[PDB]
RNA sequence: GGGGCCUUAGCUCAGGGGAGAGCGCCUGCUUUGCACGCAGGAGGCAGCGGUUCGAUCCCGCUAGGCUCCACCA
RNA sequence: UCAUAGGAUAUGAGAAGGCAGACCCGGGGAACUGAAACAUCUAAGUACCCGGAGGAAGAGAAAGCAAAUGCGAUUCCCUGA
RNA sequence: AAGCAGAAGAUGCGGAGCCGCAGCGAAAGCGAGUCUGAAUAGGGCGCAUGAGUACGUGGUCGUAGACCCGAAACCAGGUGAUCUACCCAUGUCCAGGGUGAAGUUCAGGUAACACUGAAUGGAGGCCCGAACCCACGCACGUUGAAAAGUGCGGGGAUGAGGUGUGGGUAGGGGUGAAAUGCCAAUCGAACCUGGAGAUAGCUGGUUCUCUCCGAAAUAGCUUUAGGGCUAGCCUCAAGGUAAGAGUCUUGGAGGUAGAGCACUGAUUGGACUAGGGGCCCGGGUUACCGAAUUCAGUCAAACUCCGAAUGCCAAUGACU
RNA sequence: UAGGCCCAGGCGACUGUUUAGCAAAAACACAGGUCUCUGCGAAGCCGUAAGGCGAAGUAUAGGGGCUGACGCCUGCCCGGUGCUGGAAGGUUAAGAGGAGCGCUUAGCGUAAGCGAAGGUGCGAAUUGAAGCCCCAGUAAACGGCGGCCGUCGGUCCUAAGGUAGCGAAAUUCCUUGUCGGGUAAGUUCCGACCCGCACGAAAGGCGCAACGAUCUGGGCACUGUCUCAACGAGAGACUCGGUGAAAUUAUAGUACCUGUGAAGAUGCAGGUUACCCGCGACAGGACGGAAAGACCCCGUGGAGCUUUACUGCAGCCUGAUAUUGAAUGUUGGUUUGACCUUCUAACCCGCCGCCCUUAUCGGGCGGGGAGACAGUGUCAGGUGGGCAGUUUGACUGGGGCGGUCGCCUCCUAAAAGGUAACGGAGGCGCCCAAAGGUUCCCUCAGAAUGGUUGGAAAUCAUUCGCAGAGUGUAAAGGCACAAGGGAGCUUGACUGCGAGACCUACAAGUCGAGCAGGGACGAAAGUCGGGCUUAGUGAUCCGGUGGUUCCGCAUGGAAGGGCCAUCGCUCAACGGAUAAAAGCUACCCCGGGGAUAACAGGCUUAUCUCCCCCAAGAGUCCACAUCGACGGGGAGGUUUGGCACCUCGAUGUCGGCUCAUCGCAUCCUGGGGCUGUAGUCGGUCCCAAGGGUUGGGCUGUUCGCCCAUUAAAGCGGUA
RNA sequence: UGGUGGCGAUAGCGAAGAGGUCACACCCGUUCCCAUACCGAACACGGAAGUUAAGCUCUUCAGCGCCGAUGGUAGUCGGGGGUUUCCCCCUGUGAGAGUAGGACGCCGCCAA
């Protein structure tokens, strides 16, 4: 028999459940997060907010949409009734 | 340190063997006690030798290893001598 | 094979901001003087890669060496 | 030396020892265990040993409870909990 | 309730006490409000959306041996040195044979001795070898004749001897020519009783039937990994009730397969060529090497100009 | 019936003793040697103490440790640890002390508040022993006795670097070391050599006559130990009569080939074979019986043992105090206490005499000796494995050792999210008082040109230039309308909160518009509750600090507590068992496991063995007579292994003996092809498994080497 | 023309041309507001001598970049099969790349 070791890449962090929240044409209430991320992968619109975790919510109640803005870059935005 | 690195390095005895085959020998002394190589040394040490007849009394200042040349001398200084 | 330490001038050593302290062998010089010297042999970070403006100095991979271990049926 | 120790004698239904493997009063006083280990702690002042008892013992007539136009020895029970 | 009366009873008396009806706050305290707070703000907890209580059955839990049996072990108090270890006191046994010491004498020898040879002498943890004692070598026996022996040989056998009798040392201890050995067929800590139904996340076992429903073997944390807790998955009941699910349609996020080279990296070949040579007179040639640039080409889990199917999230209605 | 003998060697001097019941020994002991302690109430030891052994002894004795007759010897280190002694100085307890500080309160007080005395609590200086720090000595005390470079020298370090003697050893892995002896042959033995992995001088070194049921080697004699068995006697066995158990046991009318299957079938499938019942024999199987595996693992199991693990205890040392008082001096500040001397009456005497008393107990008297000491009690400090109770992690492709244990980023990850492995790569346990907020401003890296020092590369103007740069830090995501870079002013790096959401077992963690208060920047809109986002941190209990229209056990205060804010933990094993903790067990034990290891079996076949493909090349020439490179593809299941599937309520494991049996990839024999086959002998290949396929030395050995033979001295499977 | 907004560069890059009395710009000077880490380049302040050169508008083009079909193919849910480190068949879906081609602008409000 013989003896070894000494793997050394044996951790990674805790998983962040980023991503969407709620969907488009979902009915939302105020302040209801809508797309955890990291920096910008979506920006806000209208009646939409970002946070100091670069996160999303809804600064008032109505339906999601998602847009983008132009060409490569997306949106998401409240409307209400 | 010990008295065989410091003669050494302060380039009394050039030799590290001298310096212990002197001791040995028992020629020399410290503050009136007889001494060996391993014997320790500090500032204030007040040192006797032997060349012979030459009997040497001397004072320890200082104390170091890396102890280049000229240098070496300012580590102690001389009193007195006799025969 | 595993772990730790080490691998800087011929030898021994220190030193992230530019590798420098001492010592020795051989030869040569040298001379009035109680071994009191001098010049040359020669003075070069084990190697590879990376980070930094920079690496001996931080990190990583590998080699050489020293020590420790390599047990139970 | 008094004198004392000590000795001699006579009286004593003295006390000794036992128990019922239970109850109580005290002197000594474990560990397992539990704590998911473990030492503080618990188990537990238990078990066990010892000495004393009595039919009961122990405590008991306030250097108290308390905080109201105050209660009046102890003990034990229900509550308080 | 205790308690009194009452046949060991039911009952009556007994309202001291307990639960609830109002909560909030750490608390003072306030009160369907209260706490925070500077706040008539907001928010939390509460009320408005009210039913408890006593007793009984059943299920479950907690504390008690708490489903049953099961340890090795620990402590306390006692019993044991009729075995065995050692010691004390007193007794007793060791057939026969051999060796031949010291000393003494004689003789030689010496100045004396020393020394030498005989005789006597009779020592010895001396020799050989029976009783006796011990156990190395083998065989046999190994549900035996025997819970350690028998047979054939073996060792010691007048010395640290063997043995008897009577005694002593007692366990957190004793004894030990020391092996951790012996201490009543036991000993890395004796035996009996008791604590004690020790404890056991461990194994084993757990007794009649039928019916309805019907899993998990996953996550997280754990001196935790074969255990446990919560969640997940099952069941029962009461409510809400029709939210759930499937498909169709519509819209979304998401960058995987695939593909590609626009990035990062790896890479092939060619063209030109900076530059560096070698050749001739600061030039002038060389295909001798050759940067970059360029043409075309291959590749990628940690590379994307791109990008599906499926799946996922929702909305509308339709059908089921 | 009563020795077998000899040669040589190792170990131990010897005779003796020992694991009753596995081990008789090289172990123990021994006489001898040495060290140390101890002045006699010895010392040590037992005991709580009295009382005792020691010893009815007295340093030529007694106790303890080590070594082991005898002979020659027993080298260097005292640096560390121990002991011994010293001890100027530092540090350190309890006790004494008693500056001050609080609390309370009479009183003063308009109030705030101050506040004497007394009580109470806390209490500083000062003093305060042993011990420790420190200095010497000691090694037949613990213990230790090196390395580098050069062809004896030079050098580094040491406290010192192994003297003599011995040496492949009871120590030597490499190793059957080399040589020689012995032998046909000698992994053994002997003698020498020494590069002693890892001898060594009282853990004694070397030698050594005698001794040994010691271990080892060689030789003579003798033998059925063997070649290779044969015969005979007796006891069992067998038959008959009498008597008559046991272990075990799910029921059983219980066959073998292959296969399957919890991977090794009697009992299953298919096929083959087999009249029914017994007796004597064998022992291949029933993974046979026996013994809930003694190995391995696990248990927050146990016991024994060690120690510089933790915490404690005994014991010992030391000090204060009470017993415990009378003096003479001395020095201190206020008489007082302390210190040195002295005395005696306390206390003590395992000293004498007398009486109790025919008494080595004690107890009274008298003396004597010591003496306020000692001893004892209480308190305190130190030492203290002598002793006790306990701890000594988990994961783990068995365990151990290694490595890791929490958080962040990416991939794996399968286009939501999530998703493991001792899978792959990297980072954190911070930083900035501006690197934050706001307002306003502008836009990078590199390249080509020109230009001193300027240089390939500063700085320069210059056009090209989505971005190749930067973004405090790792990476991913993202950002150039800035989140990047400058300047001004500032501190929102605020207080109270928070609808509603995310993530989630819980604990927790994350985002958040908006309200109020008060602000900063800005004219204004308006932004600001830290930073470009994601890590940069830990519970509770316990204490500490500050503040408080809370409580404060009759009342007023207070102590103390609560509420708010906050500090203290690599508790890193990072959801932390305690404030407090390491090891051995081969003397071991219990509970369980095939949930987990060693043998064998099974799957795989990397490895191993064998076969084959291309064919360069060797082969004088010639690839293929025979070899066959770089490379490639398969078979087998004899190796080393990997995985853990049966077995831990037991599957006995190497080698050897006996007994054989099967395969053929054939060693011989037989039959052939080719040949770099003249012949004889051979090489290679093909078919062939019928039969056969040696005896010895060494080693436990398998294997292997050697001697001598043989036609040949085959390779493997069958637990 | 000018200002100001919206739509993925089908808007852009690039080349060629035309215009400016009004308008927009360029442009002329700092005395003041203010400013330039240097300064009237820029920012501000005022002015209008001259210039369409540039900027800005209007035309052209398809060189670069951009958009982008159909068909086919890979891949693939689902079903099935097979000599299964992979491959094949069927309903259905269906890219990328490469093409066809499109395009050097569409829509608004105000002022003269």
Do not use: R
């Given at each position: 028999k013989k003896g070894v070791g000494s793997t050394k890449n044996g951790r990674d962090s805790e998983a962040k459940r980023l991503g969407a929240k709620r969907a488009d044409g979902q009915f939302v209430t105020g302040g209801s997060i809508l797309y955890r991320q990291r920096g910008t992968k979506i920006y806000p619109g209208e009646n939409v907010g970002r946070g100091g975790d670069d996160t999303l919510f809804a600064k008032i109640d109505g339906t999601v949409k998602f847009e983008r803005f132009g060409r490569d870059r997306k949106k998401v935005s409240v409307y209400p009734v | 340190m010990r008295l065989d690195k410091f003669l050494k390095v302060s380039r009394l005895i050039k030799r590290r063997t001298l310096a212990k085959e002197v001791a040995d020998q028992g020629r020399i002394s410290?503050?009136?006690?007889?001494?060996?190589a391993s014997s320790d040394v500090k500032p204030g040490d007040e040192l006797t030798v032997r060349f012979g007849q030459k009997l040497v009394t001397v004072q320890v200042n200082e104390l170091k290893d890396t102890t280049k040349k000229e240098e070496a001398a300012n580590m102690?200084?001389?009193?007195?001598?006799?025969?």
């Open positions: - | 410290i503050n009136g006690n007889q001494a060996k102690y200084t001389i009193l007195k001598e006799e025969k």
